[PDB]
């Protein structure tokens, strides 16, 4: 009975910026998903297709754990069929998503006096992201007809902006750590059942 390494994902010391969101593949273990639901640690625990009640009763081929950091007001964007700077340019969930979205306030860890500007988010993109697409480009965004040549100025902007969490930011502007559990099901044998 190898137990799924959920402690690696939820209790990691550093979380990734949303534009460079971290994915952790989970396989060949048994996950007691209930232990997470019954925690009172999480401000958000919403499941789609699956039901969060009564779900360590299933077997999946592979489980993906996507972790990143966003502000409180943007957690509503991590859901099927949403739009906005996070859903369009940083992390996009498919319309037919089946999984669970879990978030909790991390202002005690991800805020610092003078501001914590290590957490970034993508600002510009000519096209919306596809589901589960990950864009790590930092090339200067060309907002006009003049090419930018990797130098910023008018109509040539850096695509990433920093959040800047501080301990007395409003709860909407406070950092939240998010973990998206995606359950894939195939022809292939299931490797993670979690009785």
């Amino acid at each position, epitope marked *: 009975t190898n137990l799924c390494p959920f402690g690696e994902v939820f209790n990691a010391t550093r979380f990734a910026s949303v534009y460079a969101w971290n994915r952790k593949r989970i396989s060949n273990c048994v996950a007691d998903y209930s232990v997470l639901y019954n925690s009172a640690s999480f401000s958000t625990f919403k499941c789609y297709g699956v039901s969060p009640t009564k779900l360590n009763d299933l077997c999946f081929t592979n489980v993906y754990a996507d972790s990143f950091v966003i*502000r409180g*007001d*943007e957690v509503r*964007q991590i859901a099927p069929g949403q*739009t*906005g*700077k996070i859903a*369009d*340019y940083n992390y996009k969930l498919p319309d037919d998503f089946t999984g669970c979205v879990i978030a909790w306030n991390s202002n005690n860890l991800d805020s610092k006096v003078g501001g914590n500007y290590n957490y970034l988010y993508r*600002l*510009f*993109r*000519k*096209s*919306n992201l596809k589901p589960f697409e990950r864009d790590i480009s930092t090339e200067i*965004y*060309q*907002a*006009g*007809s003049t090419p930018c040549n990797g130098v910023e100025g008018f*109509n040539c*902007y850096f695509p990433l*902006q920093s959040y*800047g969490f*501080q301990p*007395t*930011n*409003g709860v*909407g*502007y406070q950092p939240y750590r998010v973990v998206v559990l995606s359950f894939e099901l195939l022809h292939a044998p299931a490797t993670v059942c979690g009785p």
Partner: antibody
Amino acid sequence: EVQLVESGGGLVQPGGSLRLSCAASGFTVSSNYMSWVRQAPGKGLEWVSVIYSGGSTFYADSVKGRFTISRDNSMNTLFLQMNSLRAEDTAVYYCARVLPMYGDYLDYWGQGTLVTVSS
Amino acid sequence: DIVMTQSPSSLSASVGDRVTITCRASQSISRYLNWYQQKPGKAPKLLIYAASSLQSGVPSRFSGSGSGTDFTLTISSLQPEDFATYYCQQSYSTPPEYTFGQGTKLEIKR
């Protein structure tokens, strides 16, 4: 330079429809955040709608379901399709270029066109 | 929602005076605030963004300050051309709200 020139404003009866146009020069409409902001006679500014670079659109609660923001890549022009217009919609309508750093701020505005909704 | 209240709404000052306009938000908006200057019968021109940063091409006498719920627009020494209606705008909400103030009408006193 940057220039935004607006058109389409005029007189419409209650319940009618009218489509504004904003021809832009100095940037690519299909690459920037664009917003419309209206000013009723004598009153303050009121944001009505915004379109992102990726294409997602957002509206004020006063104009949702009735107004629609659009744009054309080939002629570099933003549009606002206003339907079910009311007397309160009477305002001067501006098109502006949005820069998405540090929240949003509008660094270039058009000169504006007048829309009058009266019987 | 969020409501931006300006103070004062009407204000008069002589050429050379220092001018100060106040904005306040119903919630903390840490520094996602801009200032616009709109002269009669013309389009609004942006003055300050990010609550402190002067827009390119604006005189140095326009200054921005404040963060949280209270912000301040300042004109070091008023110029005859500076009579206008100044608005503060919030860009802190997700999804957008783009809340404005009611405006502060500034007249030149002589």
